[PDB]
Amino acid sequence: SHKEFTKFCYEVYNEIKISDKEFKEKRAALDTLRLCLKRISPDAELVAFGSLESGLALKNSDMDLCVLMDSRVQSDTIALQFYEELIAEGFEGKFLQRARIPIIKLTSDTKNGFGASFQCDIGFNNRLAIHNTLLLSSYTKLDARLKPMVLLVKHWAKRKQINSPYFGTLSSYGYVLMVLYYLIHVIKPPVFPNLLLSPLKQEKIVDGFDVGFDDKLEDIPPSQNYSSLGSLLHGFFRFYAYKFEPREKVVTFRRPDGYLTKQEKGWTRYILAIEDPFEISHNVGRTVSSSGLYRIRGEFMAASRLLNSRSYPIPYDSLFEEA
Ligand SMILES: Nc1nc2c(ncn2[C@@H]2O[C@H](COP(=O)(O)OP(=O)(O)OP(=O)(O)O)[C@@H](O)[C@H]2O)c(=O)[nH]1
Numbered sequence: 377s378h379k380e381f382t383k384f385c386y387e388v389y390n391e392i393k394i395s396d397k398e399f400k401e402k403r404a405a406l407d408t409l410r411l412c413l414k415r416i417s418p419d420a421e422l423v424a425f426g427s428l429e430s431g432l433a434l435k436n437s438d439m440d441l442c443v444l445m446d447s448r449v450q451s452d453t454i455a456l457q458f459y460e461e462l463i464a465e466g467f468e469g470k471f472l473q474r475a476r477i478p479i480i481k482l483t484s485d486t487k488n489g490f491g492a493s494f495q496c497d498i499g500f501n502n503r504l505a506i507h508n509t510l511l512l513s514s515y516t517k518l519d520a521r522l523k524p525m526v527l528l529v530k531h532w533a534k535r536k537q538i539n540s541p542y543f544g545t546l547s548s549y550g551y552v553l554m555v556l557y558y559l560i561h562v563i564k565p566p567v568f569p570n571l572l573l574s575p576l577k578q579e580k581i582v583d584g585f586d587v588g589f590d591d592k593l594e595d596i597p598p599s600q601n602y603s604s605l606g607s608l609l610h611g612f613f614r615f616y617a618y619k620f621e622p623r624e625k626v627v628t629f630r631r632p633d634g635y636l637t638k639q640e641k642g643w644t645r646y647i648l649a650i651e652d653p654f655e656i657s658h659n660v661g662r663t664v665s666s667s668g669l670y671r672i673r674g675e676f677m678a679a680s681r682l683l684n685s686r687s688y689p690i691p692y693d694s695l696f697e698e699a
């Protein structure tokens with residue numbers, strides 16, 4: 377069945393998704409930050425990537441921006457100028473540089489009225505993140521069930537304290553890939569095809585990596601999987617609870633059958649292995665510790681048990697209760 381659970385899922389979905397109102401304030405915030413960039417560099421562009429761009433944002437969403445420019449112009453100099461304009465415009469934040477990568481972290485806004493806790497990260501020529509976001513955007517457009525599924529999983533993972541990359545668990549991006557991987561390579565019939573392995577896929581190389589995938593989305597047949605949202609979620613919790621073998625396997629988008637061992641990859645951290653679809657050298661689950669993985673797995677199991685439970689009524693609410 378899953379009829380009541382599905383109904384419940386859409387109810388929570390409508391409560392947790394970014395309201396149209398907040399979306400518009402974030403968009404106005406973007407226009408403001410672009411005006412400040414025009415004052416410093418007329419030829420640079422400021423693009424949004426990540427969850428706001430792909431439509432996978434919860435309420436109180438952070439903003440992820442990227443500055444594009446001529447590669448022959450050094451990003452640290454324009455970054456510092458952009459930072460000084462932002463301070464002068466009444467934004468508060470930090471300017472930092474890990475290795476050769478400059479980053480601005482905006483933490484507040486004191487004048488333009490976008491919040492006392494306005495959070496916004498700004499990178500420089502982070503072209504790979506843009507492409508990651510193009511991929512997720514295209515899937516989101518491809519099946520309407522992806523968006524609610526992702527948000528519910530994100531919301532679940534926050535409530536269970538298993539969404540902390542700094543404390544031994546997994547990033548939200550990591551959970552998006554686990555979902556997508558399930559929808560492409562596990563569920564039968566598949567919900568989505570692998571756009572990177574499409575025969576129609578055209579190679580496009582950016583910063584050393586191949587970011588090509590099939591984006592002629594209107595030519596793709598709709599899914600032959602008719603599962604309800606509730607059923608997809610249960611399938612997803614079931615798979616990572618009982619079927620997926622984190623000790624030996626890699627979540628991957630580069631194999632026709634989704635099979636990849638850690639040994640082929642040389643991934644002896646790699647407690648949990650998720651191969652970024654484009655940046656294949658990057659293990660998205662590298663933040664996941666031993667105890668972190670134990671808790672992630674246990675929560676997957678507990679979510680399965682709950683949806684499989686025989687005691688009626690099933691306390692669906694306890695899926696989003698704090699651990
Ligand atoms: N977190 C994360 N993001 C990456 C990574 N590599 C590229 N990115 C890009 O950076 C974006 C950061 O998005 P997140 O902050 O993880 O997603 P989010 O919805 O804002 O996270 P929450 O607000 O906690 O729900 C992703 O959407 C990717 O496009 C990575 O290794 N980890």
Ligand SMILES: [Mg+2]
Pocket residue numbers: 426427438439440
């Ligand atoms: Mg983010």
